[PDB]
Symmetry: C3
């Protein structure tokens, strides 16, 4: 996660470290140090599973103190902790109760995943998947307090690439 | 069975109503038992359990209890999605499932998590609150889970209440004390 | 894997180390030693999952430099890296763009898995399961240029035991 380059040919050709695999259970665990065990923290959202793989681009800083943030679309889930060579489709833009959030949207390299090769951009994503992606985030916080999420929409590849370019630059200081 | 008389984690922050449960088996797990082989340094496939029915619920134990010898208090955690094995969940009692083994009475505690870990189970106050469907799947699991094995049998006796649950917990923690 | 004996009573009674659990995702990973992580290699075949367990018999050597290959039928998948006590049902014979390949077909020992006990030969194996297994292999390299697979048919317990027997001997040489 630390020694993983951002990409072989940036910003078109980037690496993503998987965090949460598609279809993952909506449950947050939390290592107790003082204990050496995983503790069940809480149950996330209204009970909907993660609809895509979620991860990050290593060696990036997105002005969120966080790394650049990626939703990776694949026909089968990817292992948490794995690294996938990827390419951008675009981005999901959201507003929060505490600001703005863009998630990058990606598919793997065509040689890795030949089945996603027909997905040239975000407009190529079936409407059902896109609708499951946005709905996930709209229900994610659900319930909690004075928390919420509004999906503002989708941006394109060029915006994706800018997020990536800037992320790689920030991270260098 | 369970009440024969010949860790780091605490039993609860407010016994007996408020306890901790270490998950051993997640819900919906394959009915297959593996055993670590010390020599080989590998998991060996031990047996296919029962008749092929998956675990209808999460199974774990309350730490720093003894219900019988080398038998901690036994717990069936109800949660809308499975819990990682070796994970710890703060729970509360709903009641009990009462069973007879070829080795005596086996009483499983039933539980949901804490209302702030799992808001979805909040509406479940006792075993009567538990949908009929889940209740039937849980006792059915247990009816069938020794099915394969010579000289082994189970006899599900029925459900007990939150009071009986709470008493098992106390005995449990007390017996671990002795 | 190398600590592991071939069997407790060869050839009828043998051990299989599981590599690929049944129902596994058709996704191939690869450990990158410089990185200390798993890298997503490739999405395999046309997207059909592995229809059976796959492993090998330790302390063997088939005719081709590899250990004896095994297809292990079980009601439920088996953990990769685990060892199961098994018996033989027969063989699946294929032709390849580069030659032949025979796979051993096994179920676990009756006491390990009572529900496979009625399967005494390959003829007892449901046709659906059989068709599933063969189709998997036929569609597997499918989508690779100059790569193909042609299932020729099945052989019986005697050929299975022979492959085991010869395999054990080869390893000793």
């Amino acid at each position: 996660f630390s020694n993983v380059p951002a990409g072989k040919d940036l910003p078109q050709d980037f690496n993503v470290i998987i965090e949460i695999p598609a279809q993952s259970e909506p449950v947050k665990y939390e290592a107790d140090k003082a204990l050496g065990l995983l503790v069940v923290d809480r149950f996330i959202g209204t009970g909907m599973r993660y609809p895509v793989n979620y991860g990050f681009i290593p060696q990036t800083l997105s002005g969120d103190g966080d790394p650049v943030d990626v939703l990776v679309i694949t026909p089968f889930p990817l292992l948490a902790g794995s690294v996938v060579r990827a390419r951008a489709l675009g981005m999901l833009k959201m507003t929060d109760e505490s600001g703005v959030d863009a998630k990058l949207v990606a598919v793997p390299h065509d040689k890795v995943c030949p089945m996603t090769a027909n997905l040239k951009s975000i407009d190529d994503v079936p409407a059902y998947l896109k609708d499951q992606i946005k709905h996930f985030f709209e229900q994610y916080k659900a319930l909690e307090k004075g928390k919420w999420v509004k999906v503002e929409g989708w941006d394109g590849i060029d915006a994706a690439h800018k997020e990536i370019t800037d992320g790689v630059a920030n991270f260098k200081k």
